[PDB]
Symmetry: D2
Subunit: 399 residues, 4 copies
Amino acid sequence: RLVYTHAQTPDVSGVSMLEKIQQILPQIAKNAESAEQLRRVPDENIKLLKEIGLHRAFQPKVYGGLEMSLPDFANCIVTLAGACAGTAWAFSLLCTHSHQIAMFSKQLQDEIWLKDPDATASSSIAPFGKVEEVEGGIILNGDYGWSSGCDHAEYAIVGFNRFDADGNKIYSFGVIPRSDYEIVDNWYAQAIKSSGSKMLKLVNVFIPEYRISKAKDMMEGKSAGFGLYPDSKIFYTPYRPYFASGFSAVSLGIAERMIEAFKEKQRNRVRAYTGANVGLATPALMRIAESTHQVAAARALLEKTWEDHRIHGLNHQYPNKETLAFWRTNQAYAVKMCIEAVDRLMAAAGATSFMDNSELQRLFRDAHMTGAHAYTDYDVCAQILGRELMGMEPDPTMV
Amino acid sequence: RLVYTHAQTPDVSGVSMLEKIQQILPQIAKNAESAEQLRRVPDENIKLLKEIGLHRAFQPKVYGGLEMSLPDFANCIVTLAGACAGTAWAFSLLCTHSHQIAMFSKQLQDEIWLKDPDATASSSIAPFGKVEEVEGGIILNGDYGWSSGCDHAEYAIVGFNRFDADGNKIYSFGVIPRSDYEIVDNWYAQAIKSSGSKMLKLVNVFIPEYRISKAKDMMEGKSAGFGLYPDSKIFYTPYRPYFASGFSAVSLGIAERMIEAFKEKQRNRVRAYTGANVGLATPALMRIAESTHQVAAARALLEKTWEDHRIHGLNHQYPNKETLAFWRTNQAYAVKMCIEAVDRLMAAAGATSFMDNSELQRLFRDAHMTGAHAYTDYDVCAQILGRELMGMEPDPTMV
Amino acid sequence: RLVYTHAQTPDVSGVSMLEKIQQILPQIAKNAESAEQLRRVPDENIKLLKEIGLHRAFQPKVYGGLEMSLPDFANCIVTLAGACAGTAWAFSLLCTHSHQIAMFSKQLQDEIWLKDPDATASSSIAPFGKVEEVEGGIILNGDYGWSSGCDHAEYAIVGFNRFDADGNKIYSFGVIPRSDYEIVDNWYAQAIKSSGSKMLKLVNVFIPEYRISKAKDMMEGKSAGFGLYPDSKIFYTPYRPYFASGFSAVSLGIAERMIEAFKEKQRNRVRAYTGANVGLATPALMRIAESTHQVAAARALLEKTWEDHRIHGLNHQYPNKETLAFWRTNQAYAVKMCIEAVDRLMAAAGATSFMDNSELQRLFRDAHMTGAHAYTDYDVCAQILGRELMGMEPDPTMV
Amino acid sequence: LVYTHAQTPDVSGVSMLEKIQQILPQIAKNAESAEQLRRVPDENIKLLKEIGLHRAFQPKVYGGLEMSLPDFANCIVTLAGACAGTAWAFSLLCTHSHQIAMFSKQLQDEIWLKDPDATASSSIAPFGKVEEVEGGIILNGDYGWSSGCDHAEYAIVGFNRFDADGNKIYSFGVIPRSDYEIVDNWYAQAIKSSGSKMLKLVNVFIPEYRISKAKDMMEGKSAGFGLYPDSKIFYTPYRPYFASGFSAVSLGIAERMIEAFKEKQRNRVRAYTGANVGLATPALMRIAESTHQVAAARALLEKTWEDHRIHGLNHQYPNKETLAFWRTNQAYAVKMCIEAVDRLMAAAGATSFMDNSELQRLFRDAHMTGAHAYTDYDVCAQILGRELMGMEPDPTMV
């Protein structure tokens, strides 16, 4: 039988990563309230997740990595997000950054992972930094905000624009060690508080050429690390769809948890005005069903999209324009469905659900935040897909 | 690569049913306007569809049937509905009735198919008929409305209640020959006009016991025809999910066609008031994208659900309560999504789209009709699933 | 006490126009089915409406006109649209055209109304005609589509572009007699069938200068007829808001009728599947309530907007940019709300509601058509208002 | 008319609305510290009492204004744009006086001859345990969510008494500040500054003259009926005035959200592309649609408030149909306002969920307006639906 409401556990030999996630999930769930107040992922959470080996999901096998398929990894992030969304969001990125690093030069990867096989990077990819072309690389200055999981990373991936002969932008990534930047704690947010999305301060940071890759090169299989792992089912693919895969996975996990949490609270629900047991009233049952249907359809869309990624990576096949537009945008539609499904239940949840002692309130805020990321903006994604479907050239105003 | 916007053609070393449908589709599409005025499926349509052998999709192999999987059949109905929704709706039922008949006694099946291997049944399943218990069977009287494809069927399946010991209802089906009823032409409708959903008039019709099956028996593998086809991947399953599988397939096919038709009309769209080319304006592009996403998610949900049916039938496994509730209700949610996606485009289509000479108007009306069937009522389906998810007993008020 | 669900009848010594409409409404309602098949307003309808004097709503008092306030007239069109939407739509335009004509020269008005005080115009305002500048006027050629009520009008108002000393478009209107054009019957539509929105064929039609007005002049109180009626509470105002006021009035009336019709059908609704009396089930009651609230809010917004028009006309005050944008766009938002409210009920109405013998089907089609007019396109209206609210220059691409 | 906010009343001298507008920047600047304080700042209460808003529904004999419902509601709308919790708590401190005006002259004298500026907070859900003693009752219970309770001198408390038959008699008791403890358990994610703390009642004696039946105050049968024969506001059901502030707050949040979103949008740049994007088409259309939606919500509310005003003027108690509309229209308006807020929050970007953004506060507060028992739209849809279909009321909800 298939499962509509959550992930089917893989029927491989031994314990799958998903089962290991499920074993530690109650611990992650119990830490969620203090994680929220800590404004970063608790050390225990990172320790438990690294212990099961999730961080090595997209690390090359030569360094002791797993090279998990996208569907399998994404389902782990979904399940994790049900316990603590900020943990799942931050940890997802710590994981997906390794997929990117695997496309940099062998020398950078050796430098990161021969030293420390458990080392991860955080990131801040919006090109706000100022770049000076020196010889053998660049000097970078800037405040690099919203680096989820940055307190727990040994490196950071940082986005910047370099310039052509002509003066056209060359969007590039640089990998820098923890010692090259200061983490400034300005993370005071109303959602995914435990993600620890603090700012990275870069003062005259020298980045050597071998630690810089063009974004377009990593979209098109033209970076320094292309061809390093000829048996890989995951590295012969655009970087960005893997990088950003966790945002919608977190959204799905929140939404699936919201349904469960709402069902739990509903059973014993009484009317304050009349004293009537009201948990199983028709309007509430129909909201539960419709939100179940809506997130089941979101899950189905995501599962089909992840499978498409998996197939492309297996065949070492870079996607055409049409599938790329779907890969870019489907996840944003899924996020939009998940927020609707969460909102349909929050609207019927009563005043007690906005109290600090209610989980619903946390799920509600975190869900809305999944739709607030630049990559999940659906107005942008609708225009991207719409233009592609109509055979128009991409709008450079968005990406 | 996977396909988000329509069906992937089955990858075989032969011509699949889907490919054969695609070959005849332009003929079906060109007949759609006269089909609409005829208020029944044109003879040419039936001839073309029977010629490729689609009617034998769920007929047992012993009688020359195909025993198609549900996913493969449903995709044929989706594709067909893009050309003519009424044809797809009526023909789908002519096909799915054979799956039901395969659960009746060998004697009835022999009687239908040894005589004529190409014989089909239409139906009218709402138990409005009056039943007299005589010996060796019943006498049935009643007007049996909305029998799609009835002009083209040699038999009819008719629903009626028989009665306990206790005064309880026993919902039953009777298969009767064309000679036992009159087709009264009262089919004057505003959607799926070409379905020919005319009424069957039954005057003192004697139905012998061997041509009567209990509905519950055909839900639970307890009917006279159970175990007849031990190698079958499709008959060891509840009848109703196959019977009613075409409603949402038609809805999906209309919605996928609506997107294409809207895109075609949009390219050259000029503003009457200002004289400016407006086809590629941002609002229209975003509607196109969102309706594309919405029906892609509906397709994904349906494909997952059909796969679940296929797997259950393969294993001869009757579904548990939870999956049954999903099978019953997922299709209604998908219909609801498809109508939303159609409506999003119709709202932006302009006054010319409500003219008789526009296809959009036909797609719009036919789409809304798919949500109007008793089986696709989403209020009913939300209550059914909601109650099941909350561990409540089924509401006998609906089914 | 106030009324949320329909119009309050004006308290005046004497029978108000609204009461007179209410008296003849059952006759209009009973003619609706044959009106639909006739594809134009039945002679009896025109006769009844002219008998109560509604056509003289916006005709100057000097010619025997009423000079009704916009709110009072709009409520008559709302009530009328509950009986027959096509009649209300066509007749509304026959009425509002007189407001426009009142801004042309005294000579044209004398020519129309001294001859025949009961004479009306239809229109086709999209500037598709080809214009030759001759002396003393123009020669116009073109097919002028969608002229609602044209079979019953003695004149037509026709839109065309003239050109500047410098080649800039001068959007203009010409009033021509019935003898100058052929009505071509190409009116085959799926909504407001009884509007008789046939095409006007113009072959080398000479229009003298005194029968031509600039649109901008009639927006800004600069046309030949400005200042003719110094005591008027209605003529010192932009022409367009009155011209186009009937589209949303018709939408409101359809929506208010749909609620009533749905309530009537619901009372006795039995389940075909089970036999239970289901008319008063919770989901249906909530749809009834929400559609009641939604159209009450639409009515409230329209009433406030009509009052704003009434006040401006009373004071002879031409609206500023902000109020003009609201006048232009509020009606389109109201139409959008009314269609949502109709759709919420149609979705729960069952298969019998799509039969030709059901009124719901007619209300459903006609409602959607109200959202299909160029003036009620909400994508256009959202951009118009949005740009104004943000202090941006108007987009010439729309109007 | 004005579509986007209230028209200021044209009177000689200053209207209450103008006075609200004068103090609004002070209320707005206090909103962040009000949020952290988890109650209305003393300065806010002082400013609002100084302009005399608390005396809106107090009888004229005690120095009250007897404001019309529309005029009062528009003051709460405007106030909610600056601080939603302040508006929400203060609205209730104001509307309670309308209720108190239906109690006995003796209770009113006792409250207002003593202190003309005295107000009540409330907790109306009948969770308390009642002992019938003689000359009144003894009440025990935890009475949660009493907005503005730190600033009130009295509390109105809801409880069930019983019939000869054992039937529920839903009643209200007015008790002094000295008879209860304010327990600070107010830790919420919206309207934080409302200070909706709990009232602890331990063996509180309430004398009969301080108890009124809810139904009596719905039907003009309470002890205070007929006390103010010239009043344009007291010959009316209590509950529609009591609960009028919830939707007023929702409207004010929504109208502010539009303004705040417009302000942030002007200079908006894409992080990934560095393009000025504030005036892009999708954002303009969201601004317009949210403007239309809250304009229609305002129009519906204004019409409903006018209907209340007219009924009160004529001393006319509403029939069943208008009562159902009065009960439910405000909940539909709240639902529209939240949609309008959500349409803008969905396009607002990640910076809008930071603590230093106002949008985040408006978003949370808006959703909370839809979370009150009186604004539950599922309940309201059933109430209206049943009435429209000629069915008897469902006792399961009210």
